[PDB]
């Protein structure tokens, strides 16, 4: 969120 | 010329996959002539295929010295860089090899990778089509494009686009080289369910190259539960124990484990973040292992197998900070897939997926490498309850009877109405309404002051947007707020007077026939607005384009900002309907969705990702809800807000049954998780190899 943080799943690099 | 000899004897012990070999030789090569800038480069690439990146870094700054013309030893320095989190040192280095060669496509296209990892889109999008202006075949820089483009909503020339990624990954496929579609996107394009189990085997296969250069022998595993006196030693592993969705679900199972049966190992891969989510599972866990703290996955797995693990669990799958190599050195007689990953690992080191009869039909087994394990219900589980207990119970103040205008929610909420004399009690629990008298004209004064806070009859009342200020903790839901919390449609422009669809996901889930979908909804139901979220912003213009041009004036859909934890749970109190997106489902976003008592209107398809929401749905025990084909969808969500009567019945329904169904029951879960895995244990013991657990 704006002012802080919203983790979410994501894609590991590759 | 020797030395070139040396350079090309290393090449070929490299080819033959004698790294270490490869490495003496091409040491070799510099003894022999010490600048000697490929065979610097090569070394530096083979170093960093090992893991070793602060070595190879050294080499990557003897070639860029030698040929200051090297455009490629930057470029590949710079991917060295990011794997070592060097975020700005990466950049700089991308940068350099532009400029030292313009017409470098892959610099530009690692350049937006920075630049979309870093969040920044359309400069993402700027540099990869750049990359792909200078070189138009690009698997890489095409497919990564089209995934900026997802998260956008931007659909220029979609259909096409779609078919290009299809033929894109059927030619790698074909030609072994590793797909430039990432598994854990695959669900968004329409691949075959071949092709989406394929990539993930290639990924799969990633890891088991990477581990077999440890020339680790198999392990040796427990054959009984003798050792553990009796008990079922479960290893769970993730990176995601600490601030994250994975945690927001699963937080209170370990802890919910019984002892007398079960030993609890977590295994975390990240470094402890300091939040109460990791203070939770460490204080609850049997065990807790920080493995962020042994980089060697060799060295990692030993522990997990010295351990005594029976059964080990796969938290991520293809998602970031996993080690599945952990997992491919195969530490345990028996690895699963749980939660985190949704969709198959395609590898063969993975024994079981963790799934239901609705997610993942046994018609479909195909989809998955993995043997089916079903859980009973659905294998969703949330930890709501826990986190949200505030709003197990709802009051509204009637402003003109309204169930989602303005909302009370809190602990002492009860205790708050008693000091209230002429509160009325809606039969559904029940339903308290506060009438519009003083102390509601205080309430809605504080809200459109922007007050964060005011006091009425010595109890604390808090504006719902000023959540952080009054304790960041509650905000994030790792505490239970110990104000009331006063939530209303004037707080995010919503009106007063229409139906309220909302959809709550990040936008990257949407596509061009879902929002056709919901624009048919809206012209249906003249007095209605879909809400979507700023997820993000740069998605906003786009959406709004394609709903104009479908005809729906800028007043139909309202943005709201992607808010802190608690309050995004709250805020769906004042939905009427959650529309689902059919492509990708909300899956921890429909667990909050659900919590708030809102129905949510699904069409599941055939992928994993796509078919959750229809599970949830079904523990739930709304099969009304779930839709066979579009039609039914836009039908459905018509008659949710169109027939008032209804609305309220289904309403009804979702709010008492997310209390009296398993969906939100984490210790029902936890038990039936634990069937399951005795199971798993009870079928190996016996000597077979994995098999379809379907009850
Ligand atoms: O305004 C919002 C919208 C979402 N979320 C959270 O953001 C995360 C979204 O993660 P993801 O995309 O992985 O959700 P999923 O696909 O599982 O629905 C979830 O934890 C939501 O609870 C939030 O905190 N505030």
Redesign the interface.
């Given at each position: 969120?704006?002012?802080?943080?919203?983790?979410?799943?994501?894609?590991?690099?590759? | 010329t020797h030395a070139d000899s040396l350079n090309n004897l290393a090449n070929i012990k490299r080819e033959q996959g004698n790294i270490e070999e490869a490495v003496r030789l091409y040491r070799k090569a510099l003894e022999v002539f010490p600048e000697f800038a490929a065979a610097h480069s090569n070394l530096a690439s083979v170093l960093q295929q090992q893991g070793k990146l602060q070595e190879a870094l050294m080499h990557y700054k003897e070639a860029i010295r030698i040929s200051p013309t090297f455009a490629d030893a930057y470029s590949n320095m710079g991917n060295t860089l990011k794997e070592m989190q060097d975020v700005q040192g990466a950049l700089q280095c991308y940068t350099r090899a532009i400029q030292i060669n313009p017409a470098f496509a892959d610099a530009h296209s690692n350049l937006a990778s920075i630049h979309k990892d870093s969040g920044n889109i359309p400069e993402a999008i700027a540099s990869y089509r750049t990359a792909l202006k200078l070189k138009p075949d690009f698997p890489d820089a095409y497919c990564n494009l089209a995934h900026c483009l997802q998260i956008v909503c931007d659909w220029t020339d979609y259909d096409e686009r779609m078919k290009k990624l299809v033929s894109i990954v059927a030619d790698q496929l074909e030609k072994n080289r590793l797909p430039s579609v990432h598994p854990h996107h695959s669900m968004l394009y329409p691949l075959s369910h071949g092709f989406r189990k394929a990539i993930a085997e290639r990924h799969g296969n990633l890891c088991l190259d990477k581990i077999n250069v440890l020339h680790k022998p198999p392990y040796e595993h427990p054959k009984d539960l003798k050792l553990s006196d009796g008990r079922l030693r479960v290893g769970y592993v993730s990176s995601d124990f600490g601030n994250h969705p994975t945690s927001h679900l699963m937080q209170s199972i370990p802890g919910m484990h019984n002892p007398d049966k079960f030993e609890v190992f977590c295994y975390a891969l990240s470094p402890d973040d300091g939040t109460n989510f990791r203070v939770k599972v460490m204080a609850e866990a049997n065990h807790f292992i920080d493995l962020s703290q042994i980089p060697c996955n060799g060295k990692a797995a030993d522990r997990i197998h010295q351990d005594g693990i029976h059964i080990l669990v796969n938290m991520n799958g293809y998602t970031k900070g996993a080690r599945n190599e952990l997992f491919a050195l195969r530490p345990a007689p028996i690895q699963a897939m749980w939660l985190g990953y949704p969709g198959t690992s395609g590898a063969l080191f993975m024994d079981y997926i963790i799934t239901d009869q609705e997610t993942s039909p046994a018609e479909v087994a195909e989809q998955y490498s993995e043997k089916l394990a079903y859980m009973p219900h659905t294998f969703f589980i949330g930890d709501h309850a826990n986190m949200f207990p505030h709003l197990k119970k709802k009051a509204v103040i009637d402003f003109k009877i309204y169930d989602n205008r303005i909302v009370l929610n809190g602990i002492d909420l009860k205790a708050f109405l008693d000091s209230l004399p002429d509160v009325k009690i809606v039969k559904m629990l029940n339903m308290p309404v506060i009438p519009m008298n003083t102390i509601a004209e205080a309430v809605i004064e504080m809200i459109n002051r922007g007050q964060i806070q005011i006091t009425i009859n010595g109890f604390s009342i808090s504006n719902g947007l000023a959540t952080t200020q009054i304790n960041n903790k509650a905000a994030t839901g790792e505490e239970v707020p110990r104000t009331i919390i006063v939530t209303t449609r004037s707080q995010y422009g919503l009106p007063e007077d229409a139906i309220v669809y909302c959809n709550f996901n990040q936008l990257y889930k949407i596509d061009p026939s879902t929002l056709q979908m919901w624009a048919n909804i809206l012209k249906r139901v003249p007095n209605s607005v879909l809400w979507l979220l700023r997820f993000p912003a740069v998605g906003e213009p786009n959406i709004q384009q394609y709903a104009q041009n479908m005809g729906l004036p800028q007043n139909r859909i309202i943005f709201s900002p992607v808010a802190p934890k608690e309050e995004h749970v709250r805020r769906g109190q004042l939905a009427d309907v959650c529309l689902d997106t059919p492509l990708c489902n909300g899956h921890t976003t429909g667990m909050d969705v659900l919590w708030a008592g809102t129905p949510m209107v699904t069409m599941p398809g055939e992928t994993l990702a796509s078919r959750v929401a229809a599970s949830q749905l079904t523990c739930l025990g709304c099969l009304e809800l779930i839709a066979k084909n579009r039609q039914e969808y836009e039908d459905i969500a018509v008659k949710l807000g169109t027939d008032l009567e209804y609305l309220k019945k289904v309403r009804g329904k979702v709010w008492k049954q997310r209390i009296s169904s398993p969906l939100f029951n984490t210790k029902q879960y936890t038990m039936e998780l634990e069937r399951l895995y005795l199971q798993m244990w009870e079928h190996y013991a016996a000597g077979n190899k994995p098999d379809h657990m379907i009850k």
């Open positions: 969120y704006p002012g802080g943080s919203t983790p979410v799943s994501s894609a590991n690099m590759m | -």
